[PDB]
Amino acid sequence: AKCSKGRTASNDACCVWFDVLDDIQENLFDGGECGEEVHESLRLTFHDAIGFSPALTRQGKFGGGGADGSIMLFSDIETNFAANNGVDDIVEQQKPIAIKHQVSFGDFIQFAGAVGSSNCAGGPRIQFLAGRSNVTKPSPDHLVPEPFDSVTSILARMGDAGFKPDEVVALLASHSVAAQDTIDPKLAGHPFDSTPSDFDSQFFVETLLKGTLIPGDSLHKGQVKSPLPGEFRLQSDELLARDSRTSCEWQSFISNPNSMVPKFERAMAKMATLGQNPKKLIDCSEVIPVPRGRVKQPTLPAGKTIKDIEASCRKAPFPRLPTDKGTFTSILPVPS
Numbered sequence: 001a002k003c004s005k006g007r008t009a010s011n012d013a014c015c016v017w018f019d020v021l022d023d024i025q026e027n028l029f030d031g032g033e034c035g036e037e038v039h040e041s042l043r044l045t046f047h048d049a050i051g052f053s054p055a056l057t058r059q060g061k062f063g064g065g066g067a068d069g070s071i072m073l074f075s076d077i078e079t080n081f082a083a084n085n086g087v088d089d090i091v092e093q094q095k096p097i098a099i100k101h102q103v104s105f106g107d108f109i110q111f112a113g114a115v116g117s118s119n120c121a122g123g124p125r126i127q128f129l130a131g132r133s134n135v136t137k138p139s140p141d142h143l144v145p146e147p148f149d150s151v152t153s154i155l156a157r158m159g160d161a162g163f164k165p166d167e168v169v170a171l172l173a174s175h176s177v178a179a180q181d182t183i184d185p186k187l188a189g190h191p192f193d194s195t196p197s198d199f200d201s202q203f204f205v206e207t208l209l210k211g212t213l214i215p216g217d218s219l220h221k222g223q224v225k226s227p228l229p230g231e232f233r234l235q236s237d238e239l240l241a242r243d244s245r246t247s248c249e250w251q252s253f254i255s256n257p258n259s260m261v262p263k264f265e266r267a268m269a270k271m272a273t274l275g276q277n278p279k280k281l282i283d284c285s286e287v288i289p290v291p292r293g294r295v296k297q298p299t300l301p302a303g304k305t306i307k308d309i310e311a312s313c314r315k316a317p318f319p320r321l322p323t324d325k326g327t328f329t330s331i332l333p334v335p336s
């Protein structure tokens with residue numbers, strides 16, 4: 001098939017996404033930058049997808065429709081979940097966009113995440129299937145994992161959805177390109193790692209550092225201590241990095257940074273299609289750009305040493321990674 005601007009799709013129905021791609025890379029991702037709107041976007045893929053409980057379904061109860069765009073269709077309901085605070089912003093930006101192209105909301109949300117992550121340095125190229133219904137029902141509450149939930153409860157929430165523990169760690173790779181706004185509003189935009197626009201293993205490293213700093217005037221529900229100024233640290237992430245169910249895979253992304261993108265692509269492709277039949281969708285992965293950027297060597301921050309690493313696995317010693325030189329430069333917030 002032939003699409004706009006001299007472009008080609010194996011399947012004709014994918015042709016609309018090429019023009020969607022042009023719009024969001026300009027009028028949402030600012031010339032395809034890996035910034036706030038990509039971060040929000042990528043986070044939005046999860047808040048839509050995870051509204052999916054087969055355990056609830058098995059009991060004659062509605063268990064959510066996963067990647068069905070309901071968070072957008074029923075924004076009023078869903079975004080006033082406490083687990084969904086700060087989410088209404090990127091929903092209300094995306095909504096008019098997906099309307100003009102008459103793509104379904106579920107399709108659109110998975111698209112923006114797939115597109116934006118490709119904008120990130122050493123970013124992943126996420127599979128993108130299309131044709132999700134635009135008819136669904138709002139997600140039941142309390143399905144989204146909270147940063148103050150226990151690992152045990154978090155594993156069980158994602159296992160219910162479909163994920164084994166290894167896969168959760170993989171998905172969390174998204175935190176490399178991430179900051180918070182609602183745990184501590186006064187620290188809004190401070191990233192979970194030192195390089196929030198690179199898709200690198202720095203998140204897995206800095207999560208294993210000891211928490212030594214209180215960045216705000218106090219700590220908060222779901223927040224623990226940071227290892228570095230400018231950096232925020234989630235309770236859930238600190239735990240998962242050290243939990244013996246998850247510590248070794250957490251570490252695997254450090255000892256083998258090449259494995260991070262393909263492992264994260266696999267799991268994302270599951271997530272983008274929770275509550276969906278892939279055999280009932282068409283493959284428009286072509287539209288999603290090839291990411292630029294080499295896999296970076298993971299480094300220990302300036303001022304840090306292997307002594308600062310809370311090594312939590314068990315089968316395999318921590319890898320000998322070099323320390324950055326100089327004094328540590330306090331980490332700049334993600335732009336407004």
Ligand code: HEM
Pocket residue numbers: 036038039040041042043045046086145146147148154168171172174175177178179180181182183222234236
């Ligand atoms: C497994 C349970 C998870 C928990 C408990 C969790 C928790 C959080 C929290 C508390 C924030 C900060 C939100 C705020 O207050 O502004 C955040 C940010 C973010 N999360 Fe996660 N998350 C989880 C899984 C995921 C997954 C599966 C993805 C994507 C695959 C993801 C992608 C993101 C992104 C991209 C951000 C940055 C948002 C921004 O910078 O505006 N998270 N997460």
Ligand SMILES: [Ca+2]
Pocket residue numbers: 047048049050051064065066067068069070071139
């Ligand atoms: Ca949903």
Ligand SMILES: [Ca+2]
Pocket residue numbers: 175176177193194195196197198199200201202203
């Ligand atoms: Ca990063």
